[PDB]
Each structure stands twice: as structure tokens, then as C-alpha cells.
């Protein structure tokens, strides 16, 4: 729980950098919440917000 | 597959002389990128060096190696000598990206004392690093002066052991990462003139 404080902010920055305009912000907030509570794979994190 | 991306390019700026001014660039990259800065095409900060020692420790493995690195360039006493072309260059061994901006100083800096006997600055660091469980990862901090390093993980001191290695250049090497290693790692740089701290973040991704 202490670690999670930065985690959501860090994942969302990564996701927005990977997708750019293709990623809806509140949808990325969900990726961050899901992946900061449970270990996700590299494959999921990078493509969840923009699979195309 | 290698990818490198600037988060926000530098903007041209007219700045008052004698007042400290700070440029920043953030770069997302796979594999890890290094950042260096040029002034009118000449290197003024950072290096081209990559973390080959970690590539060795992961030799033969599948490597995720993704994240964002950040860097700051501080112009202490902006004078006419400092008007020109500023460049932030990202490099990951396969790809290079460069963002370039014009900085024009209006005025001079006769009063300004500059960074004489000033606290250290952390000018480059791992903002986030993603790596697969079971691999070695590195969190980077670099200072603008010779410093001694101390690392914290989630408010707990990091000591050298079979897992962690605090290198004298400011790298934190973490062997055989597991999900519990996830979180914020704080680098503390000290010299006789003060200390600087910077937070880095590590995410051990799932093994598949």
C-alpha cells in the first residue's frame, strides 16, 4: 500500500507516453489502479490503453 | 522492439539574465535511455554511456527494460555567454532522439554568485523502470558533482548484499527482482555542501 502511492502516477505516465493521444485518461487511470494492485505483464501494461 | 519517445519538447525562451533557469526533458524508452545535453552542438552535461553491465547480467534472458528517464539542466547565472541553442539528446543504443530549443538571455549577470560551494544536484534519474521478475534491474541517479550515495526503499535503508549493490556512480543494481521489490526507491546524494534526493520507481512485471 505504501508503494502504491507513486505506482499509479508512474504507470499512467508510462501508458500515456506509449499511447499518446490514443489513450483516454480515465481509462488509463483504471489500468494504473488494476496494475498497482496486482502484478501485470509487460505485454498488458504497454498495450491495454491502445491495442491498435 | 526498441522505442524511444520525448514526453515534451523544449520550448524557445527569452529569460532574464542573472536568474537561475532550468530546462527539463523526460524520455520514454525501451531499452533504457541515457540523456545528455548540448549547448550550440557541444556536450555540456551527461554522457552517451549505456548500462552494459546490466545487459551482461541479463545476457541470454528475455528483457522487458522499459520506462521513463528524466534530466534537468540548470543555468546558474544566465549571461550573454549562455544565449544559444540548447539540446536534449536521448539515446538507447539503437535509437536517438533530440529536441532543440533557443534560449535568449535579456540582460547581464554582474551580481550573480553562481554555484560556488552549492549543494549537489541530481541531474539525471530513472523516473520509472519496468523489468520482468527474475531479471536484474537498475535504478539510476546521477549528480553534477562527486558525491556519496545512500539508497532507501519504501523508507528502509538499502545495504549492499546478495540482492542490492550501491555503485559509486549512483546506480542501484537489484538482482533477481520479485513483485515485492515494487515501489519507490530514494537516492540521496551527499557531499560537504549539502544533499539532494530524488525518487525513482521500479515495477517488476509478470513473467510469461
Swiss-Prot record, chain A:
What is the purpose of this protein?
Probable insulin-like peptide which negatively regulates synapse development at the neuromuscular junctions. Probably acts as a daf-2/InsR agonist ligand to prevent dauer formation under optimal environmental conditions. Acts on AWC sensory neurons to regulate high salt chemotaxis responses.
This protein's superkingdom?
Eukaryota
Range within the parent protein: 62 to 112 of 112
UniProt gene name: ins-6
Q: Which family does it belong to?
A: Belongs to the insulin family.
What are the disulphide bonds in this sequence?
Answer: 7-36, 19-49, 23-50, 35-40
Annotated organism of origin? Caenorhabditis elegans
Provide the tissue specificity. Answer: Expressed by ASI and ASJ sensory neurons.
The protein's name: Probable insulin-like peptide beta-type 5
Q: Where in the cell is it found?
A: Secreted
What if the gene is knocked out? Answer: Severe reduction in Ca(2+) signal in AWC neuron and in chemotaxis in response to high salt concentrations.
From Swiss-Prot, chain B:
Tissue-level expression reads: Expressed in PVT, ASK, BAG, M2 and ASI neurons. In L1 larvae, expressed in pharyngeal ectoderm and mesoderm.
Q: Which GO terms describe its cellular component?
A: extracellular region
Where is it localised?
A: Secreted
Q: Which domain of life is it from?
A: Eukaryota
What GO biological process terms are annotated to this protein in UniProt? neuron development
Q: Ig-like C2-type domain location, by residue? A: 1-104, 120-203
User: What do mutants without this gene show?
Assistant: At the L1 larval stage, display defects in the positioning of the ventral nerve cord (VNC) axons characterized by axons of embryonically generated PVQ and PVP neurons, but not of RMEV, HSN and AVK neurons, from the left and right VNC drifting into the opposite cord (axon flip-over). These defects are not enhanced in a zig-3 (tm924) mutant background or in zig-3 (tm924) dig-1 (ky188), zig-3 (tm924) sax-7 (nj48) or zig-3 (tm924) egl-15 (n484) mutant background. In a zig-1, zig-2, zig-3 or zig-5 or zig-8 mutant background, cell body positioning of ASI and ASH head neurons is normal.
Question: Is Signal one of the keywords?
Answer: yes
Q: What is its main location?
A: secreted
Q: Which UniProt keywords apply?
A: Disulfide bond, Immunoglobulin domain, Repeat, Secreted, Signal
Does the keyword field hold Mitochondrion?
no
All disulfide bonds of the chain are: 25-88, 141-187
Q: What does this protein do?
A: Required for maintaining axon position of PVQ and PVP neurons postembryonically in the ventral nerve cord (VNC) by preventing axons drifting into the opposite side of the VNC that could occur during body growth and movement.
Recorded protein name is Zwei Ig domain protein zig-4
The organism that produces this protein has a lineage beginning with: Eukaryota, Metazoa, Ecdysozoa, Nematoda, Chromadorea
Q: Which residues of the full protein are shown?
A: 43 to 248 of 253
Amino acid at each position: 500500500p505504501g508503494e502504491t502511492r507513486a505506482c499509479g502516477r508512474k504507470l499512467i505516465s508510462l501508458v500515456m507516453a506509449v499511447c499518446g493521444d490514443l489513450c483516454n485518461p480515465q481509462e488509463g487511470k483504471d489500468i494504473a489502479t488494476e496494475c498497482c494492485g496486482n502484478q501485470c505483464s509487460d505485454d498488458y501494461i504497454r498495450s491495454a490503453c491502445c491495442p491498435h | 522492439p526498441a522505442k524511444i519517445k520525448i514526453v515534451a519538447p523544449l520550448e524557445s525562451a527569452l529569460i532574464p539574465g542573472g536568474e537561475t533557469y532550468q530546462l527539463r526533458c523526460d524520455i520514454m524508452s525501451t531499452p533504457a535511455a541515457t540523456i545528455h545535453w548540448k549547448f550550440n552542438g557541444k556536450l555540456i552535461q551527461g554522457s552517451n554511456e549505456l548500462n552494459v553491465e546490466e545487459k551482461l547480467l541479463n545476457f541470454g534472458k528475455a528483457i522487458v527494460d522499459t520506462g521513463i528517464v528524466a534530466s534537468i539542466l540548470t543555468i546558474q547565472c544566465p549571461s550573454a555567454e549562455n544565449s544559444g541553442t540548447y539540446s536534449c539528446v536521448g539515446y538507447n543504443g539503437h535509437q536517438t532522439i533530440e529536441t532543440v530549443a533557443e534560449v535568449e538571455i535579456e540582460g547581464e549577470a554582474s551580481g550573480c554568485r553562481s554555484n560556488h560551494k552549492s549543494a549537489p544536484e541530481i541531474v539525471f534519474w530513472t523516473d520509472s523502470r519496468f523489468e520482468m521478475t527474475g531479471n536484474v534491474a537498475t535504478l539510476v541517479c546521477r549528480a553534477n558533482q562527486q558525491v556519496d550515495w545512500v539508497w532507501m526503499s519504501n523508507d528502509e535503508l538499502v545495504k549492499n548484499n546478495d540482492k542490492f549493490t550501491v555503485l559509486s556512480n549512483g546506480d542501484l543494481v537489484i538482482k533477481n527482482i520479485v513483485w515485492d521489490d515494487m515501489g519507490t526507491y530514494t537516492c540521496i546524494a551527499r557531499n560537504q555542501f549539502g544533499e539532494a534526493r530524488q525518487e525513482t520507481f521500479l515495477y517488476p512485471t509478470a513473467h510469461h
